[PDB]
Amino acid sequence: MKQYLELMQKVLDEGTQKNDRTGTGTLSIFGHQMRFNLQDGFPLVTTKRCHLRSIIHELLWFLQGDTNIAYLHENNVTIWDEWADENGDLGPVYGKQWRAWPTPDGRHIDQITTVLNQLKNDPDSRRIIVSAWNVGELDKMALAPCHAFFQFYVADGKLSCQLYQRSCDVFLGLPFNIASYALLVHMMAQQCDLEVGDFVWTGGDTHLYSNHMDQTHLQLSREPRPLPKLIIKRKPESIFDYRFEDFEIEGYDPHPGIKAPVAI
């Protein structure tokens, strides 16, 4: 996509070398923002073939409140394998915080239900927030939350969302993160009888791994194709009752896939 290739080029033009946790090394910038008007089309990268089925299953898994990879394996999705323990557990990562953030007095807060009720009852609220950054549980998580903090907004009958992504693997992770949040906006909008607005993506440490540079430049040589179109075939009774088969992506005509290794 235009915005995505422009970000790649910005990291290349303005980034600096950094060592990193994984021992791989990155080229890194700090701070970026871009927007996707979801009425233009569904923002799935076209300059390489992306594995959409994994994106959908990962989001459904988050929405169930799950943090063990068994459900992903049942659906032939392997994207979380490298960080799970011997029983498949990642600890209290995204799904757990989204559905059941633990409070100091023994409560748990379902932030997804909270947001939905805020959008329906008080859409001009400035507090329509989900946070995965539960400071008191970070040490139990297999990785710290990358897509950390997000906010909804309504104007002119349209639902928008902004994500603060504190750490972004531009080549491997970002295509998934953009599509995932776009899908969530569509689902949330359907449940609220709203149209879709913008997905606003904001980055913290926004980086290209040192072993993704040939792949990145191959991708930058390619022209984006038309955005595909997302069709939802049913309105479930709640945001938690979607199924994989409720979604179809039309007109997706990507350039060939480009393989790259993930940094563990």
Ligand X SMILES: *[C@H]1CC(=O)NC(=O)N1[C@H]1C[C@H](O)[C@@H](COP(=O)(O)O)O1
Binding-site residue ranges: 21, 51, 126-127, 166-169, 177, 207-209, 263
Partner interacting with residue 76 (select from Na ion, ligand CB3, ligand X, none; CB below 5-8 Å by kind): Na ion
Of 170, 141, 212, whose CA–CA distance to 34 is shortest? 170
- 262 near ligand CB3 (CB under 6 A): yes
Instruction: Specify burial of residue 101 (Cβ count, 10 A radius: 0-12, 13-18, 19+).
Output: buried
Stretch that binds ligand CB3, among 107-115, 150-158, 219-227, 256-264 (CB under 6 A): 256-264
> Do 88 and 69 contact (CB within 8 A), yes or no?
yes
Q: At its nearest, how many Å lie between ligand CB3 and the CB of residue 107?
A: 27
**34 pairs with which residues across the strands?**
201
| Cα distance between residue 90 and residue 100, in whole Å | 15
Q: Which of 12, 20, 225, 232 binds a copy of itself (CB under 8 A)?
A: 20
If the CB atoms of residues 113 and 151 are measured against ligand CB3, the closer one turns out to be: 151
Q: Which of 74, 105, 126, 139 binds ligand X (CB under 6 A)?
A: 126
User: Nearest-CA neighbor of 63 among 9, 18, 100, 27?
Assistant: 100
Nearer to a copy of itself among residue 30 and residue 244 (C-beta):
30
Contact map string, positions 57 to 86, toward Na ion, x by CB under 5 A:
-------------------x----------
Q: Which two tokens stand for residue 20?
A: 């990193």
Nearer to ligand X, 18 or 217 (CB): 18
Positions annotated as catalytic residues are 146
